[PDB]
């Protein structure tokens, strides 16, 4: 156990006429990573309270809009996950075609490029971050047989799929996703900013990064002056994310999170079928063999009352970490054109 | 049925859930009228039509006459138990020569005593006066519930008694006085105490005494319904098998609905069912066979109507959330489906989308920006007559950017745009005076 | 009449949950009736406030699923009114060099106007139009020194060198006032030879 | 467990409030305070069968361990087909016009 370091201990040579001047500078390349959607939940509310029998599904009835109401809910986040991607990307719908020769003035895009080579139109690093996530609970989609086998085939996302609880697939797949992202590098490779304010304008390529020099406040000469310095360390500093993404699987543990929160979320759900809530059994069919309608009803009731306590939870959890992704996405948009369709003063 | 009615409250509207995928849809969202998207919707397209009832085919009558007409039974505190065992629990059998003053049941109803089945029976028999019937029962007290026969809080079983005075003449023995009370099903058979008199209390039972003091036969049943071999089972006759089709089953008593399948589960000698982790009962062991069933959700997987507005057109199309075309007509159990319904199982516009198969929208190759978002990357439109047609949308213009290391473009013109950009700053300020809606 | 949709939703949710909570008033939660005077002429308080209980919670627990909706959607108003409360600021006190933050195109102006429950913003930007192409060069090489435009590019019209600002054509004599010079011209990748006017 | 309980020894008279030589006229039903006594009730075992003993809110089988403020008892003698009409939310001759 330990004190905290705050930071490494530092002093500044003040003086009323001293200044420092660089001399030299840093091409550097910083990875932000950020979660647009999650996973479009669904729940069949009368599947998931009353498990398919007419005797709970008639007294359910009784209880009225609230399974409505849950539904509604849930296919409010589940359309607001499709528009958080839909304003981070597609915000150019000009699908500018990825040009043939991948370098520009010495600067190698190749690695952000989609490969004509490979199959899937990926860039190199969105194949990396695409194997870097996993899906730990083999993420859903469960074909039609699957849930049929041994003791040993048993698994959570079959008890959520007999149980109503579903996925809905996301609208734009993710060849659709690469395809924006293709096509936004390559108008900046090629148009630089001017394809964000109107019709996409060719630049060549060191004119355009001569002119995001004069926006950082360093002459235009200097640009061209070190051009060859600037692109190596560029192309260097790519390469630099491309080892870490192969080597490193924390840098995109801010989406692995949603992943597991919405993972985990789904699998108390189902585990909270097995409560009994109070009743002589959590098993509804043991309750109507066992007991007569006078006071079978009562132990239902229990049970009804206790399940759809917990998927009003559910709904509000999603509700709430909903909110947070939709502040990511809105923060992601403004990023997308600030930082991808510009260049930004904001420190 | 939904059924909608006028202010004068005669019906002018009603809807068939189990007709057609609209109906469906209209029954799905409470309303008769329904504006263009896709919706998930809940199975009203099939219920079971059958049981399948099948229980083991043990035979021998349960030995009622013995354990109720014994020649005499126990002392109170002498209550003897035994168990019962193999047996068919047809107790109707005494509706001809008994009544029975008492008979109470406890974490079963005795309705349904005619058509469980019980992994464990035993029966404690005693003689009581009838004014003290009343103390078996669980949480009682009293001598009997204190010092002679204590049941447990969770006692499942059942009490039963009789008036016996005119046969059980006689002297016997209840304890009156203990240190300490009995633990549930307890006993103590000690007559003398230290010194040599007997501690034990003297019941006089005559017919002449009076009613209270009238001796009863008191017969407890005590159950349970573990997942164990059936031991006593009611008197149901067996069905055949029905496999693949939504059924109602009763498997020892075990009732419910869903469909039926062959299984690959490895069950243990003595299991008789199986339960996921959401104690959904996953599979069942036939008692007849032994052979090891699935049982699969009679509504099992995903389904969605997508429709136009129903002010547009009453056509629909069905998505079939992760099922392939082929197997449409097997995940929905299409034969016990409406003809109607059946319609949207098979045929022309058939197409597999990556969400699921897509029946009744026709695959169009011109991709449109997205009017009714199916998924991975479909969407759908009602379309030029008219159909609904599923497309993969369109993400934007087919462009592209003449670069050259040489080369620019300068603008010569320049357009002065006016953008709309509308947000929202309020809502409408709700109050609720919570007494008042609630009480 | 879909301009303003984002304001017609926010009336539509918050009408269709008020009438939602009160159609909630009918159900039973498994009471014998969802009428509570029902209830209290048929049965004796003893098991009267049984079958009350069950509605009070069951009422009580729609009232705390509404104010739960309510919680969460002024949550999401009150990031649209902090959004708008900015453009306020940035787009009407003032101009915005946030790329798309003021409306498409470079912002020039926005205006604010009333709307029921809401604000429209109407958002003025230039956008530049009916574009050519030109040859282009970084520098110009004049005397063994290299020029640098010291606003816009270089550009020639076929024939000619000139200056232009980079978003509207308006070629200028390069000059050494539209000019400053910088080194050697070796090091410049894609230097030109031209001459730079001196008044 | 520490159990402490007040030490009052003089046992309930049970034997004056259920054995009196007779009880009231059910329209003329008699209290009586009962106070600084041991309700041990299993006395009665021995020589008293109750066909009714009903308790609101307390069990019956709690009764040997608690303690209480104050304990009145009202008797009165009815026939036995009246006595279901002695407990709360009845009606009857009894339940209207005499207790
Ligand atoms: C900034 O520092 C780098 C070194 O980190 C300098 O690069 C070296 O430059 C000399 C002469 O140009 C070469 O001989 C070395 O091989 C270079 N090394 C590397 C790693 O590039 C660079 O010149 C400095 N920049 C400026 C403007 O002086
Ligand atoms: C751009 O970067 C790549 C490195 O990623 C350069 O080298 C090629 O890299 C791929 C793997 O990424 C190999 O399969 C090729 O064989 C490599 N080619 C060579 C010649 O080494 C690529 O050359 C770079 N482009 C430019 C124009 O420099
Ligand atoms: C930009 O384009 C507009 C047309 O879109 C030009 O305006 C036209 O100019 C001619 C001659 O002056 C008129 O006859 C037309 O009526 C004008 N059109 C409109 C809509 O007013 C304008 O001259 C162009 N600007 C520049 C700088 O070239
Ligand atoms: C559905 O089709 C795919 C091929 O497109 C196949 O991999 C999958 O196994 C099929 N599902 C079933 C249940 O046969
Ligand atoms: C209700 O009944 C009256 C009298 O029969 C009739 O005039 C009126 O039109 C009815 N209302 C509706 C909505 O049909
Ligand atoms: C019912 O009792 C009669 C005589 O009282 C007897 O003949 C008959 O066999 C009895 N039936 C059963 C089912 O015990
Ligand atoms: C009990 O058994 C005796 C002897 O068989 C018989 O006479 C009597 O009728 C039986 N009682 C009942 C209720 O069956
Ligand atoms: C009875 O049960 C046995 C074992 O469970 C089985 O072999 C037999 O087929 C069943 N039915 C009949 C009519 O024998
Ligand atoms: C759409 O294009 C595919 C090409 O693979 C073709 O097979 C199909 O017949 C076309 N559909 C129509 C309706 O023309
Ligand atoms: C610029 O040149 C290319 C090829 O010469 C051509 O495709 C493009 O349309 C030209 N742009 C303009 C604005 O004329
Ligand atoms: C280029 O512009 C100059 C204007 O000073 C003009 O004299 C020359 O002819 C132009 N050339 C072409 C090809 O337009
Ligand atoms: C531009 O490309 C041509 C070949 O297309 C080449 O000859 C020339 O040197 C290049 N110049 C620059 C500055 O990239
Ligand atoms: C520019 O001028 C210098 C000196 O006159 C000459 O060496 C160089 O080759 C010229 N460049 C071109 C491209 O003509
Ligand atoms: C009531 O008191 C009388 C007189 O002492 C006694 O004979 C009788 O047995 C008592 N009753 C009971 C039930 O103890
Ligand atoms: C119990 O009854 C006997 C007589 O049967 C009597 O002698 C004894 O005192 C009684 N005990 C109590 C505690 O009343």
Not at chain 1, 51 to 76: H, K, W
Not at chain 1, 326 to 344: H, I
Not at chain 2, 110 to 130: E, G, H, M, N, Q
Not at chain 2, 346 to 365: K, M, P, R
Request: hydrophobic share 40%.
């Amino acid at each position: 156990a330990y004190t905290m370091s705050l930071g490494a201990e530092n002093s500044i040579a003040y003086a009323n006429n001293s200044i420092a001047i660089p001399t030299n500078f840093s091409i550097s390349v910083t990875t932000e990573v950020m979660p647009v959607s999650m996973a479009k939940t669904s729940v069949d509310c009368t599947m998931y309270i009353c498990g398919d029998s007419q005797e709970c599904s008639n007294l359910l009835l009784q209880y009225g809009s609230f399974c409505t109401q849950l539904n509604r809910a849930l296919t409010g986040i589940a359309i607001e996950q499709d528009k958080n991607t839909q304003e981070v990307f597609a915000q150019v719908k000009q699908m500018y075609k990825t040009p043939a020769i991948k370098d520009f003035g010495g600067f190698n895009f190749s690695q952000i490029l989609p490969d004509p080579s490979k199959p899937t139109k990926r860039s190199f690093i969105e194949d990396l971050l695409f194997n870097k996530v996993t899906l730990a609970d083999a993420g859903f989609m469960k074909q039609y047989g699957e849930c049929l086998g041994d003791i040993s085939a048993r698994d959570l996302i079959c008890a959520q799929k007999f149980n109503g609880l579903t996925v809905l697939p996301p609208l734009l797949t993710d060849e659709m996703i690469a395809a924006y992202t293709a096509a936004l590098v390559s108008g900046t490779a090629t148009a630089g900013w001017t394809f964000g304010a109107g019709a996409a304008l060719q630049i060549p390529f060191a004119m355009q990064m001569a002119y995001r020099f004069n926006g950082i406040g360093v002459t235009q000469n200097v640009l061209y002056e070190n051009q060859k310095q600037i692109a190596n360390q560029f192309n260097k500093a790519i390469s630099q994310i491309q080892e870490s993404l192969t080597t490193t699987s924390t840098a995109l543990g801010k989406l692995q999170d949603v992943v597991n929160q919405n993972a985990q979320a789904l699998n108390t759900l189902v585990k909270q079928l097995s409560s009994n809530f109070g009743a002589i059994s959590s098993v509804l069919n043991d309750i109507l063999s066992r007991l007569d309608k006078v006071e079978a009803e009562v132990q239902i009731d229990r049970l009804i009352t206790g399940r759809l306590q917990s998927l009003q939870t559910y709904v509000t959890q999603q509700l709430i970490r909903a909110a947070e992704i939709r502040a990511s996405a809105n923060l992601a948009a403004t990023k997308m054109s600030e930082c991808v369709l510009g260049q930004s003063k904001r420190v | 049925f939904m059924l909608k009615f006028n202010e004068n409250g005669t019906i002018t509207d009603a809807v068939d859930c189990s007709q057609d995928p609209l109906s469906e849809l209209k029954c799905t969202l409470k309303s008769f009228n329904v504006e263009k998207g896709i919706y998930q919707t809940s199975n009203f397209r099939v219920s079971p039509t059958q049981e399948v009832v099948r229980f083991p085919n043990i035979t021998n009558l349960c030995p009622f006459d013995k354990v109720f007409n014994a020649t005499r039974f126990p002392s109170v505190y002498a209550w003897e138990r035994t168990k019962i065992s193999d047996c068919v629990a047809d107790y109707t059998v005494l509706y001809n020569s008994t009544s029975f003053s008492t008979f109470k049941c406890y974490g079963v109803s005795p309705s349904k005593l005619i058509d469980l089945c019980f992994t464990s029976v035993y029966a404690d028999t005693f003689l009581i006066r009838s004014s003290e019937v009343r103390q078996v029962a669980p949480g009682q007290t009293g001598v009997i519930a204190d010092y002679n026969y204590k049941l447990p809080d969770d006692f499942t079983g059942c009490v039963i008694a009789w008036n016996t005075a005119k046969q059980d003449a006689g002297n016997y023995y209840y304890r009156s006085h203990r240190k300490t009370k009995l633990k549930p099903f307890e006993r103590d058979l000690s007559n003398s105490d230290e010194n040599g008199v007997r501690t034990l209390s003297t019941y006089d039972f005559n017919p002449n005494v009076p009613i209270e003091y009238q001796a009863t036969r008191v017969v407890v049943l005590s159950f349970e319904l573990l997942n164990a071999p059936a031991t006593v089972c009611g008197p149901k006759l067996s069905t055949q098998l029905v496999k693949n089709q939504c059924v109602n089953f009763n498997f020892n008593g075990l009732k419910g609905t869903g469909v039926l399948t062959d299984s690959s589960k490895r069950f243990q000698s003595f299991q008789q069912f199986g339960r996921d982790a959401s104690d959904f009962t996953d599979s069942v062991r036939d008692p007849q066979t032994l052979e090891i069933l699935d049982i699969s959700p009679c509504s099992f997987g995903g389904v969605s109507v997508i429709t136009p507005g129903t002010n547009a057109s009453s056509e629909v199309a069905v998505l079939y959330q992760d099922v392939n075309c082929t197997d449409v007509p097997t995940a929905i159990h299409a034969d016990q489906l409406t003809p109607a319904w059946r319609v949207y199982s098979t045929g022309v516009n058939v197409f597999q989308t990556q969400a699921g198969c897509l029946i009744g929208a026709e695959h169009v190759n011109a991709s449109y920006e997205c009017d009714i978002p199916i998924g991975a990357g479909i969407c759908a439109s009602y379309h030029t007559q008219k159909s609904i047609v599923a497309y993969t949308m369109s993400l934007g213009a087919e462009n592209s950017i003449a670069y050259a290391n040489n080369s620019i473009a300068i603008p010569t013109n320049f357009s002065i745009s006016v953008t709309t950009e509308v947000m929202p700053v309020s809502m409408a300020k709700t109050s609720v005076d919570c007494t008042m809606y609630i009480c | 009449s879909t301009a303003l949709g984002k304001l017609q939703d926010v009336v539509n949710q918050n009408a269709q949950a008020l009438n939602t909570l009160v159609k909630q008033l009918s159900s039973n939660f498994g009471a014998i009736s969802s009428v509570l005077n029902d209830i209290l002429s048929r049965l004796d308080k003893v098991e009267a406030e049984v079958q009350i209980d069950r509605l009070i919670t069951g009422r009580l627990q729609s009232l705390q699923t509404y104010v739960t909706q309510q919680l969460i959607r002024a949550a999401e108003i009150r990031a649209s009114a902090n959004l708008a409360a900015t453009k306020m600021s940035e787009c009407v006190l003032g101009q915005s060099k946030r790329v798309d933050f003021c409306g498409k195109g470079y912002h020039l102006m926005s205006f604010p106007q009333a709307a029921p429950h809401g604000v429209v913003f109407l958002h003025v930007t230039y956008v530049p139009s009916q574009e050519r192409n030109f040859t282009t060069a970084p520098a110009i090489c004049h005397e063994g020194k290299a020029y640098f435009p010291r606003e816009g590019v270089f550009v020639s019209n076929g024939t000619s060198w000139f200056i232009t600002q980079r978003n509207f054509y308006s070629p200028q004599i390069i000059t050494t006032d539209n000019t400053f010079v910088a080194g050697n011209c070796d090091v410049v990748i894609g230097i030109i030879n031209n001459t730079v006017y001196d008044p």
